[PDB]
C-alpha cells in the first residue's frame, strides 16, 4: 500500500501525511482489547496474543483451530490444519495463500484478507449469537387512563373511568411483567396476568414460568399457568424463514448458476466444483415454479424445472420445532374446575417432501392422540392427512370413545388465472369431544351437542390487471339438530386512476337465533392530494375524502362520509370528522356524526373524541404515557411496545432522531425509541439541524442488536464549546493540504484544509495551538489565539494568526 | 304447583372505533439497498384502538382488503415501479387481501388492540424513481 | 232403567256395570268445594213408568279411586248431605217418569291442602261407587259398580283458592328487560296467604337463579325476580295482608342478573316455582 | 468505484448544513477521497468549509459528507448561485510491482451546487412555463425572465437534434440553429429531483 | 369505511460509477534506440485501454469527457513524465479516441461536445494511447507519468 504524492498536488512537496493511513505505526503489544474483523464486518472481540513475525509491521497473530471454527473459515478446505495441536500458533500467512495481516490500534480493529473461494458457506443475512444484549438491570412502568361522558335524555347521568397499569421488571436475564386495572363506576383492583419468561440462547428455546398460551396450529388456545418449554422462530434469519427445497446439483468445473423464476433472475452466484447445496430461496408459493440451470464454460446447459408448494404445516429439512407445556387449567369461568394436564408436541423434517408430526395430551381424566403425515409431491400440490384419536370422560361416570379426521388440500398454478389457497374439510363422529368440555362441570345429562363436520372455502380471483375478486365461505354441521352455520363473504377491489372503488358483500347465519343477515355496502375514496396545487407549507394538504353507502336489502338505506387530513408540518395533530344519515328498515332515522381529535406529543398522548347522534351523546377523552425509571433518573416519553432503545446524548436539547413523528429529546438529553425491532440490526440516525450553536456531535450512525425485552444504550459523545475559523501561516508560507492540529485543553483535533485554513469544534477562549504536519523532526509551529469578548452572538468568526517560529 | 317459564336471548352489539387515520411514514430511502433482489427496509410498528364494547361481544374478527398485483402483494398506486407492500404481524403470518384475524377481548377494561407492521421491500430489485401510494381498507366484523 | 248421556257413551260392560264418560268442572266454593257434578250430564230415566219403579240408592264402602283415594269429603244426594263414604244406607229415590231428568249426585272434597291441585289425565280412575237398584215387582236385588272416568286433562284444585294459570311463559327482550307477569289469585274467603321463592341457585345472597339450557347456554347471565320496589330473595315468606275475593295480583318483575365477568352470548332458560303457605 | 448521493445538491437559505452519502463498490481496492469547492469562474474559493476533506475508504463502506456555510451574507437575494463541487479519487497499488512501468488514472466527478434564497414570490414548481424565444435566421436566443435555473434537454426544432444549453437569469444565450429546422419547438425540462419531465409545447409572440 | 391507513414514501436515484484500470508499458525501447529521427515521427505500438461504466440510473443522459494534467514546455499538447534522475530524456504521451484523433490537453468544458449513453446496458469507452519522442535521442531509464479522467454530469 503505497501512494504517489506527485499527482496528489502539483509540486514536489506535499504533506508527509500519507504514511499514517495504511501502515503508520508499529507496536509490540498485544493485549489491548482489539476487535476481530472478517471481510469488513464486526464478528466478535477477543484477546489475541501477538508474537514476533516477519511482515510489513513485524508482528503476526496467533490463533488456534477451535477459534477459526466460529469465525467462518472452512477448516476442511485447508490441509494440514488437523495435524496441528490446539494450543499453538497457526501460520495462516504461509499455509493459506494470499492472507496478509492488517492491524490498526487507532480505531481498535484487525482485518483478515481472506478470499471467498476458501471460505465456507452460510445463509445470506446471518446474525452472530454472541452479539446479543441481555439488558440493563432496571425496572419498567406503563400506564393508561381513560374516561367517558355518556349522556342521554331520560336517565342520562352516568360516568366511567378506566385506568390501566403495567408493571415490568428486568434484572439480569429475567423478564418479569405484571398487569392490572382500576375500574370506577357511578371499584377495586383486578389482577389479570403475571408471568416470568426466560430466553434460551444455546438450545434455542424459550422457557416461560407462569401465565401463557399454546399455539393455535395443532390445538385450540388454552390459557394456563405454569412451565412452558418451547422454541422460538424469531431467532432464525429471514433468509431461512419459510419453505425451501434442497437443490442437488453436480458441477464438473467452475460455472455460474443463475436461479431464474418467471423470466426474472432472482439469484446469481458461483459454485465450487462438485456437490453444492442451495438454501437461500425466499417463501413465494404464488409465483409459479423454479428454473434452475448451470451455465458451464463450454456451452453445456442443464435445463430442469423444480415444482414448489406452500403449506404452513410443512417444514424444511434440517429444522426441528418442539413445545412442552405444563401447568393447571385456568379459563376464568366460575363453573369450571382446575385440573392438571400435560401437553407435548414435536415436529421433525424428513427428505423428499415428507413431514412427521404428532403430540399427546396427558391429563388425569383426558387423553388425546394425534398423528399426522404431510406428503409433498410437486405438480399435484400437497396433501396432509392426520388422524385424531381422543378419549374423553363424561362427568356422569361414563367412558366413551371417538376418532377424528381433517382433510387439507393445497394447489397452485402460475399463469392461467388466480390459484386456490386453502381448503379444509373436518369430519368427526358423535363420540368426539374436546378438552374444554371435560373441564366444564358443576356437579352436585347436561348437554350432548358437539360439532359434526366443518367445511372451509376461500377462492381468490384476479381478472385483468386492475381488478381483484375475493370469495370466502364457511360451513358447519351439528349432531341431532339441523342448525347450519354459514358465513359467506365477497368483496371487490378496483382502482380506476387514483380513486378507489370497493364493493363488499356479507352473509352471516348463526344457530341460536333465526334469520339470515346480509349486508351490501360500498366505499368510495377520493384523495385530494394531486388534484390541487402544490406548495411548500399549505397546512391544509394531505387531505382525502371518503364516501360509503350501506344497504342491507331490507329497506334500511344508510350512508357514511368523512374528510380526514393533516394540519401540522410534523404530522402530530390528526382530525377525523365523519357523518351519516339513517332511514328505512324499521322506521328509524337520524343524523349521526363524529369528531375525533388525535394528538401525539413528545411526553404523552391525548385525544378528544366528540360523538353525536339522535338521542345518545358522549365525549371521548383519555391520557396515556409511560415512565422509564433508570439508573440515571426518570425519563418520560411515548408508551413502549415491549422494545426499549435508549439514547444517551448529553447536550442534545431538541434533536429528533429520524422517522418518528413528534419524538423529541428532553432538557436532560435522553431519548427513547418504542418503534424498533428485535434480534436484528437497526439504524439510529441523529439529525443535527436543531442543535443550532453550542453542541457539535461527531457521529450519528448507531448499529446495535437488541433482543426481546431489553434496554440498549446509545453512546454519542458530544462537545462543549464554540467553533472558530483561523488562518495559520508558517513564516509567510501557507500550510499544506492536510495536517494535524491538536489542543491540550480540548478533546477535539483538526484537519487543515486548503490555503492554511483549519476547522475546529469545541474550543475554548484561549488555548495552545500545536501544529505538526510531517514527521517529528522539530516543534516548529506552536501558536495560540485570543478571541475578543465583544463577538459572542455570532455563528462563526474569521481571524488570522502567525507562528512564532 | 304453578310453573313459570322464563326465556331470554343475548345478542351482540358493535363497538366504537377511535382511530382511523394512522399514517405510517417511511421517510427517505436509497436505491443502492434495493438494487439486489432480496433486501428490505426497517420495520414500522402500528396499532389500533378498539374500546367501549357493550355486553355481548367477546370475539372481534378484523378483515383486510385492498388492491393486489400479479405477485400476490399489494399494488402500488404511485409512479414508482418494482416495489410492493407487505403486511405481517407478531406471529409471522402473511396478511394478504382477504386475511382475517380473531383476538380475545379483555373484560376488566373492555378494550381491544391490533398491532401491525408495515415495511418497504422490492422483489426483482432495482427500484425506480417515484412515489409510494397505498390505500388499505379494514372492515370490522362482529360475531 | 237407562241413563242415556250426550257427552259420552255409557256402554254396559258387565251387565249393570258401565263406564260413563263425563266432563269435569271444578267449582270453588265456600267451605266445601265441588269436584264432579253428575247432576248436569247424566240423564237417568225410565222406559216403563207404569209397570216397574226404579229405586236407585247407594250402598256402603264407596270411597275414591286411583291417586285421589287418600282424600275425603262430603256428598250431596238429592238435597240431603252425607260425608264421603257413607257407613250406612241412604234413602231411596223413586223413578216413574219418561222425562229425562238428571241424577242429583254431587261429589265434594274437604280441602286439606292449601292451593295446589291434582292433575287428572284423560281416561283414568276417579271414584268407585257401589250403587244399588231394587224394584216393587219382586224382592230381587242386583248389584252393580259404576266407574267415573275422564275424557280430558282438567286439573282439580284441592283448596279453597284458585290461581289464574299454572303454566305461564314470559318472553324477555334482548337485555334490558322489564315485563310484568300476569297472574291473578282469588279465593272464596278472606284469609291470610304467604308465598316464597324456591329454586336452583348458586350465588351467595340467594337472589340469582341458575341458567339451565340445552343448546348453547349463556355464562354470567342470571334470572332475578323482584317486585316494584324490593328485590325478593330465596326462601322468604312474603305476605300481602287481607286477600279479597277480587282479581288480586302479585306484581312481579323478571330481570337479568350478572354474576361473572365474562359474558358469552347464549340462550337463557330456567325453572321458577312457587308454593302458597297459609298464615 | 465512486458513487455519490445524487447528481445535484439543493441548498435552501436558512439551513445550517447538508448531507452527502458516498458509497464505495470496490471491495478489493482502496480509494482516497479529496474534495474542494470551486466556482463558475475558476477561482478556488474558500467560503464553504467542508469536513473531512482527506479520508481513506477500504472495501464496501458508506460515509456522509457535510457542507457548512461561511459566506457571512454577502450574496444577492434576487437570484441563485451556480457553484461546482469536485470529488477526486485516488487509487492504490501494490508494493512488489514498483520495478515495472505502469500508468495510473485520476477520476474527478463534476457536479453542480445551487443556492436557493428564502422568501420569494414565484415557486420553482412552475418556473419552466415562462420561456420566451427569439428565432433568428442562423441562431436562437432564449429569454428567462424568472430568476431561476433551467436545464433544457432534448431540444428538437423538428427533424434536427441540438445540444444542451444553460440560460442564466436576466441575460441572453445565443446558440446555434440550422437552416433546415421546422416550425414548432419541442423540449423537456429538468426538475429539482433529477427526474424527467414530460413533453410540453409553446407558441411565441 | 371504518379504518384507513395512508402509506407514504419517496426514493431518489443514484448516479453512475467509474471503474479505473491500469496500463503497463511493454515497448522496451525498440524504436527509441536506432532513431535518430525528427519529433514528427513516432512509431510506437498502440496499447489499448478501456474505461468501465458498470450500472447507472435513469438520471444520466449525456456527459462530457476530458483529460487534464501537467503539460510540457516544448509542447502543451503532450504529457510529460516525472522529473527524476532514473528516467529517460525527452518523451511524450499522446492520447487517442475511438476515431483515432488528437485529444487536446487541458481543454475547457466550453469547447467540447456531449456524449449520449443508454441506461440499463453496460457502457464501455474504448480509448487509445501511444508514446512520442521529443528530444534528440532517448536515454535508458523509467517511463512514469500520470493522467486524469474527469467527467461532467448534467
Automatic annotation (TrEMBL), chain A:
<dbReference type="GO" id="GO:0015473">
    <property type="term" value="F:fimbrial usher porin activity"/>
</dbReference>
<comment type="similarity">
    <text>Belongs to the fimbrial export usher family.</text>
</comment>
<feature type="domain" description="PapC N-terminal">
    <location>
        <begin position="2"/>
        <end position="146"/>
    </location>
</feature>
<dbReference type="InterPro" id="IPR025949">
    <property type="entry name" value="PapC-like_C"/>
</dbReference>
<dbReference type="InterPro" id="IPR025885">
    <property type="entry name" value="PapC_N"/>
</dbReference>
<dbReference type="Pfam" id="PF00577">
    <property type="entry name" value="Usher"/>
</dbReference>
<keyword id="KW-1134">Transmembrane beta strand</keyword>
<dbReference type="Pfam" id="PF13953">
    <property type="entry name" value="PapC_C"/>
</dbReference>
<keyword id="KW-0472">Membrane</keyword>
<dbReference type="InterPro" id="IPR042186">
    <property type="entry name" value="FimD_plug_dom"/>
</dbReference>
<keyword id="KW-1029">Fimbrium biogenesis</keyword>
<dbReference type="GO" id="GO:0009297">
    <property type="term" value="P:pilus assembly"/>
</dbReference>
<dbReference type="InterPro" id="IPR043142">
    <property type="entry name" value="PapC-like_C_sf"/>
</dbReference>
<dbReference type="InterPro" id="IPR018030">
    <property type="entry name" value="Fimbrial_membr_usher_CS"/>
</dbReference>
<keyword id="KW-0812">Transmembrane</keyword>
<keyword id="KW-0732">Signal</keyword>
<dbReference type="Pfam" id="PF13954">
    <property type="entry name" value="PapC_N"/>
</dbReference>
<dbReference type="GO" id="GO:0009279">
    <property type="term" value="C:cell outer membrane"/>
</dbReference>
<keyword id="KW-0998">Cell outer membrane</keyword>
<dbReference type="InterPro" id="IPR000015">
    <property type="entry name" value="Fimb_usher"/>
</dbReference>
<protein>
    <submittedName>
        <fullName>Fimbrial biogenesis outer membrane usher protein</fullName>
    </submittedName>
</protein>
<keyword id="KW-0813">Transport</keyword>
<dbReference type="InterPro" id="IPR037224">
    <property type="entry name" value="PapC_N_sf"/>
</dbReference>
<feature type="domain" description="PapC-like C-terminal">
    <location>
        <begin position="725"/>
        <end position="789"/>
    </location>
</feature>
